[PDB]
């Protein structure tokens, strides 16, 4: 039981009715094309031995109807298969997001927010792509292979074995070899690829002081040599991809040669029409196979995406009182924020209580690209505009709000990019002020702030009567504590 299979049933199975609908439409389209080829050969051969024009009427009407049906059914099948795959992906995304809303402290924090997007965006696309390049190619290919082997088998069960062996060889060995070559290419020489992140991340932010000296061209030579080595290694590893590229043509050639050889020794036995059909079908039965040179590649990509999706320190205890001020500081490498969430967890006491007491405010808080009113009512949606304006003025955003064309209704396209970093942290501080949590926990609230303001904001926040008054607890995990100050110190290790 591989994780891909586990995730397949996990994703709320795609409502198999519309899976089989797409499979049937694809089989109908490709079988219609194959039957058009066969009926075409039969019509030509029958018209050769001069008959009266009575059966040619039904043969001709069948030919024209089959052509038009092939076109329209191909289009409809493409639409239906895409519909099924993308509906499945959407429901899987909704379910996975639902699972990311659980009370216990799951991996929902052990991961950042940007790469959480980098998962939830591409992973659902990959899972959709495993329903377009695994339903269609494999299912339609096996059905059409069976239906085209049987037609030759009933005529003669002697060359049908060769056709089946050849179809299996093409449609299995060729994509398997292509996938293996592609996989082995991108992992081979995974040490000269370090030179990419060495040079391109060396001589792209370090350009001027490299340019003043004559060391630029030395770097150019020293990474070009290793890039060339990587290219040679990748070529050597991906050489067996050309064999897989050329295999289907050799398959078709062997198939048609075998068909002609078999038809030579069976022409006098049967009618001319059957001989022509047996001779001309093999060259037109390989259209389904060519649709899956990437099906194995898509399988590998979806497998790695499924593994990535499946992938989805202790601190001391500190006693707290309702109204104390803490100035927790520590070196880079200490669980200061982890201590913050530990205090929040022990204060909240897990689920079972409605009036949540402690809520951590991380520095990397996302900024919604909505109106400022909506962006600020996330913590509390029952705050009047007067309170928001007063908070913005008291944190240093009255002048920023005054220039806004829509006031509090500014949409702020792009999220955090719509405002400055200091402005964004000011909005975060205002949001923390708005929230009515009995215990408020801050994580570096004085970063990226103004030089003449950050000290004052830190002083006011850690003052028990400047911004948060009396019964409100403020815990700050900062790095710029003033040399002369107060409040207890819980310096970690």
């Amino acid at each position: 039981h591989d994780p891909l299979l586990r995730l397949t049933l996990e994703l709320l199975r795609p409502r198999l009715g519309r899976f089989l609908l797409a499979a049937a439409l694809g089989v109908l389209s490709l079988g219609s094309a194959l039957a058009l080829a066969g009926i075409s050969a039969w019509l030509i051969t029958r018209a050769w031995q001069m008959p009266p024009v009575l059966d040619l009427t039904v043969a001709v009407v069948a030919v024209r109807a089959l052509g038009i049906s092939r076109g329209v059914l191909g289009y409809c099948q493409r639409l239906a298969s895409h519909d099924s795959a993308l509906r499945a992906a959407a429901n899987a995304r909704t379910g996975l997001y639902r699972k990311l809303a659980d009370a216990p402290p799951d991996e929902a924090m052990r991961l950042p927010s940007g790469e959480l997007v980098a998962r939830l965006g591409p992973a659902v696309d990959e899972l959709a792509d495993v329903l377009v390049r695994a339903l269609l190619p494999i299912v339609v290919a096996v059905v059409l292979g069976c239906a085209a082997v049987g037609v030759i088998a009933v005529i003669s069960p002697a060359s049908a074995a060769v056709l089946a062996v050849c179809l299996v060889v093409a449609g299995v060995v060729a994509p398997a070899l292509a996938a293996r070559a592609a996989h082995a290419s991108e992992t081979v020489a995974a040490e000269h690829r370090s030179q990419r992140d060495t040079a391109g991340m060396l001589a792209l932010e370090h350009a001027p002081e490299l340019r003043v000296s004559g060391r630029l061209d030395s770097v150019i030579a020293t990474f070009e040599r290793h890039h060339r080595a990587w290219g040679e290694a990748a070529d050597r590893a991906a050489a067996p991809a050309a064999v897989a590229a050329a295999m289907p043509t050799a398959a078709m050639g062997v198939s048609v040669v075998g068909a002609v050889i078999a038809g030579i020794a069976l022409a006098p036995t049967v009618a001319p029409t059957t001989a022509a059909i047996l001779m001309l079908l093999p060259l037109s039965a390989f259209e389904a196979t060519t649709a899956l040179p990437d099906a194995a590649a898509q399988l590998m990509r979806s497998r790695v995406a499924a593994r990535r999706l499946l992938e989805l320190p202790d601190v001391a205890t500190v006693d707290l009182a309702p109204g104390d001020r803490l100035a927790v500081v520590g070196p880079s490498g200490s669980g200061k924020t982890t201590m913050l969430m530990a205090i929040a967890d022990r204060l909240n006491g897990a689920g079972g209580e409605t009036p949540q007491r402690a809520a951590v405010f991380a520095e990397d808080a996302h900024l919604f690209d909505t109106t400022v009113r909506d962006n600020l009512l996330v913590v509390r949606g029952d705050a009047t505009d007067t309170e928001l304006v007063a908070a913005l003025d008291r944190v240093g955003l009255g002048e920023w709000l005054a220039g806004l064309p829509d006031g509090l209704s500014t949409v702020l396209v792009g999220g955090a990019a719509a405002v400055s970093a200091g402005q964004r942290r000011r909005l975060l501080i205002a949001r923390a002020l708005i929230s009515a949590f009995p215990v408020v926990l801050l994580d570096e609230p004085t970063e990226n702030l103004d030089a003449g303001d950050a000290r004052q904001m830190l002083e006011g926040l850690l003052t028990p009567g400047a911004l948060f008054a009396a019964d409100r607890t403020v815990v700050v995990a900062t790095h710029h504590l003033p040399p002369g100050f107060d409040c207890p110190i819980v310096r970690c290790t």
């Binding site: 052509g67 370090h206 809520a359």
Partner: protein, 505 residues
């Protein structure tokens, strides 16, 4: 051998179809000779076609790798010129390009270019051969062929109103989803933890129906291509069968036309299938090419006279004479790194013109000018490796011992287990920030240079080391060199004979 290989493939497809049709016609009419020549001809035709396909694959792989390498090298070289004004803005794009961002051009060079070349070669040649064997089927196919562009243009012009609206709704809703999923941890530690689950439901519903509309509009091209490439064969078959029943056309010609219609109509379908997989590579190539042509370095050949020149800034009334210590003070980020990098001549001077030794920097010969100078930047050069090499990238050090003694690098080299041989990581890993700065002074202060520029020389340094480096810099200035810093601290301010107060705006 691209065009040669494609010509070989086209020839061995057309000839294989013709030979097969003739063999079938010959051994249907006479079911009693032709087995030896024709069969061997067909076998060798298929064999050479296979060999040509494999050789084409290898050649395309090699060519794509070479093109990727050359393009990456050219992009990196071009972006690394002077004028860091554009560099600070396009470094993200350049870093994206020389990364797993150009590997998407491999499909463009693998499955699209050979497809379009084969479409351009095989289709007219197969049309010619079919016309030679039978002109009515060729006429039908020809009438069909300029009916793909007409219908495609008609469809894409009649319905070019819903596609744009559907795409706009698609991208807006997708951005809504991406930003909402981006902020889930923020909404986790508040009261509203699961109240947003309902919104994603109909947001997904609307996004998926919008993408349904755009997919329904955008597939019509495939429908048109399939319908025409199939109706062509259907009509060819009907015509050949209906006009062959009156004993007035050889079976071989009919079979040849019937077998050659799919060869005419296939490469266009292959190109259409392979097109959608090459849009990303073309975009990456366009982005890479858009950032190469613009830079064109200028400057003159004037040579500053021997000695330490006089630098003057009329805009800020700052004229700095040789042999003295100068400091710059002001707020953070008011064109001071820009001023320095301008007096290195990399970019234009924001604050008026700058005259070196009486002559403007625009007429300066930068090659010789850069050799008279010790430029210590905020972040020194720290290539992964050892300490010894990192001390030698910025040119050879003629007298590293006394410079290290003056700055105090010996206490750094002394504590290192291997002396100047301890391994050093990327960006300074295994090497302390203030001790990184000390390495910077070691590489900078020790150099033959009559002009000294330093940006905050006392970063991450204690009082004793600050005093030592200030004394060393003062001694270097007394050695007859123009030394200018930008330090904005009391020890730095009270260490230079002149103070410049460059202001904003």
């Amino acid at each position: 051998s691209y065009f040669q290989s494609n010509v070989v493939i086209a020839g061995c497809t057309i000839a294989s179809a013709v030979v097969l049709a003739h063999i079938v016609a010959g051994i249907i009419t006479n079911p009693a000779t032709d087995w030896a020549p024709g069969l061997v001809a067909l076998a060798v035709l298929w064999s050479v076609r296979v060999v040509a396909q494999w050789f084409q694959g290898r050649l395309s792989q090699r060519g794509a790798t070479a093109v990727i390498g050359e393009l990456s090298r050219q992009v990196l070289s071009s972006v690394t010129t002077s004028s860091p004004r554009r560099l600070a803005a396009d470094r993200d794009s350049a870093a994206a390009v020389v990364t797993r961002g150009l590997d998407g051009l491999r499909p463009y060079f693998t499955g699209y270019l050979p497809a379009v070349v084969l479409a351009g070669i095989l289709t007219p040649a197969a049309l010619v051969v079919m016309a030679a064997y039978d002109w009515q089927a060729a006429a039908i196919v020809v009438i069909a062929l300029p009916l793909i562009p007409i219908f495609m243009v008609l469809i894409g012009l009649l319905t070019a109103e819903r596609s744009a609206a559907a795409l706009t709704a698609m991208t807006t809703l997708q951005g809504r989803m991406l930003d909402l999923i981006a902020g889930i941890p923020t909404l986790r530690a508040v009261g509203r933890a699961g109240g947003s689950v309902q919104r994603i439901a109909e947001l997904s519903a609307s996004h998926r129906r919008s993408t349904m509309a755009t997919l329904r509009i955008s597939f019509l091209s495939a429908l048109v291509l399939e319908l025409l490439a199939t109706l062509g064969v259907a009509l060819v078959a009907v015509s050949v069968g209906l006009r062959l029943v009156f004993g007035d056309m050889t079976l071989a010609a009919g079979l040849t036309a019937l077998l050659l219609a799919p060869e005419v109509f296939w490469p266009l379908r292959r190109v259409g299938a392979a097109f959608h997989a090459a849009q990303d590579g073309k975009t990456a190539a366009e982005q890479a090419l858009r950032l190469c042509a613009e830079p064109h370095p200028p400057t003159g050949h004037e040579v500053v006279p021997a000695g330490a020149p006089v630098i003057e800034v009329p805009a800020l009334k700052a004229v700095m004479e040789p042999g003295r210590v100068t400091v710059l003070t002001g707020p953070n980020g008011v064109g001071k790194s820009t001023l320095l990098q301008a007096i290195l001549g990399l970019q234009e001077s924001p604050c008026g013109p700058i005259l070196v030794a009486g002559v403007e920097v625009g007429a300066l010969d930068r090659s010789a000018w850069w050799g008279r100078l010790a430029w210590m930047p905020h972040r020194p050069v720290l290539v992964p490796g050892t300490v010894r090499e990192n001390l030698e990238l910025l040119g050879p050090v003629p007298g590293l011992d006394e410079v290290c003694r003056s700055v105090g690098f010996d206490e750094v080299l002394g504590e290192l287990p291997d002396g100047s041989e301890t391994p050093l990581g990327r960006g300074g890993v295994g090497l302390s920030l203030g001790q990184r700065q000390r390495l910077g002074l070691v590489r900078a202060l020790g150099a033959p240079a009559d002009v000294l520029l330093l940006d905050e020389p006392t970063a991450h340094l204690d009082g004793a080391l600050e005093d030592r480096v200030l004394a060393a810099i003062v001694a270097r200035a007394r050695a007859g060199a123009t030394v200018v810093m930008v330090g904005h601290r009391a020890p730095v301010l009270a260490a230079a004979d002149h103070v410049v107060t460059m202001e904003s705006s």
